[PDB]
Design an enzyme around this catalytic site. Structure first.
Site, PDB file in Angstrom:
ATOM      1  N   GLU A   1      42.327  36.539  90.306  1.00 54.45           N
ATOM      2  CA  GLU A   1      41.584  35.488  89.620  1.00 54.45           C
ATOM      3  C   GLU A   1      42.279  34.966  88.376  1.00 54.45           C
ATOM      4  O   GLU A   1      42.032  33.818  87.983  1.00 54.45           O
ATOM      5  CB  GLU A   1      40.191  35.988  89.213  1.00 54.45           C
ATOM      6  CG  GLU A   1      39.300  36.398  90.380  1.00 54.45           C
ATOM      7  CD  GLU A   1      38.822  35.228  91.222  1.00 54.45           C
ATOM      8  OE1 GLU A   1      38.855  34.065  90.747  1.00 54.45           O
ATOM      9  OE2 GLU A   1      38.394  35.478  92.369  1.00 54.45           O
TER      10      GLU A   1
ATOM     11  N   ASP B   1      37.757  25.807  89.615  1.00 53.90           N
ATOM     12  CA  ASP B   1      38.290  26.692  90.645  1.00 53.90           C
ATOM     13  C   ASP B   1      38.904  25.864  91.776  1.00 53.90           C
ATOM     14  O   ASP B   1      38.991  24.636  91.702  1.00 53.90           O
ATOM     15  CB  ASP B   1      37.244  27.718  91.082  1.00 53.90           C
ATOM     16  CG  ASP B   1      36.165  27.144  92.001  1.00 53.90           C
ATOM     17  OD1 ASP B   1      36.173  25.937  92.345  1.00 53.90           O
ATOM     18  OD2 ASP B   1      35.286  27.938  92.387  1.00 53.90           O
TER      19      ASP B   1
END
Ligand SMILES: CCc1ccccc1
Ligand SMILES: [Cl-]
Length: 162
Positions: free
Chosen positions: A11, A20
């Site tokens: 991440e 994202d």
């Protein structure tokens, strides 16, 4: 290696609101804020989550506390779900991390729909499960992330992360 190091690699860490891979407002170590296109809605969600007026920026300590909460929530979601829990309990510790990783990325509901993969994993048919897991929108949209997670399910080692 442990689940926290695994997800930190997958991440990354950003201390300001970012988008994202799907375009959703996110912060920290992959913490989804909202699917709304409104940056103001995302900023409000951030302030609620942190407990202060952040104006879109957090500290590293705040990011790591949110991350701990998010991993905890992913584990609890597995343990509460009658379809996921028996599969999870059948796995060794390394493969359990791969399971948490998928739930962290896609949510309890999304992973629970991988019915055929779940059955193959419970039967320890690792190569067959790996092929089935790759026949997914998940693999086609985030292939490098998916390959690392699938390799972990296939081998039961950390080799994809080393
Ligand atoms: C489909 C991967 C998985 C397996 C067990 C539990 C959750 C998720
Ligand atoms: Cl990717």
């Amino acid at each position: 290696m442990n689940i926290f190091e695994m997800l930190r690699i997958d991440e990354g860490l950003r201390l300001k609101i970012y988008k994202d891979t799907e375009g959703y407002y996110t912060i920290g170590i992959g913490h989804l804020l909202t699917k709304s296109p409104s940056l103001n809605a995302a900023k409000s969600e951030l302030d609620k989550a942190i407990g202060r007026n952040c104006n879109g920026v957090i500290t590293k300590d705040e990011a790591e506390k949110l991350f701990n909460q998010d991993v905890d929530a992913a584990v609890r979601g597995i343990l509460r779900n009658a379809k996921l829990k028996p599969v999870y309990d059948s796995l060794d510790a390394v493969r359990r991390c791969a399971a948490i990783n998928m739930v962290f990325q896609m949510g309890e509901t999304g992973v629970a729909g991988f019915t055929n993969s779940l059955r193959m994993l419970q039967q320890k048919r690792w190569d067959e499960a790996a092929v089935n897991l790759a026949k997914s929108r998940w693999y086609n949209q985030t292939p490098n992330r998916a390959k690392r997670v699938i390799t972990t399910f296939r081998t039961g080692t950390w080799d994809a992360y080393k």
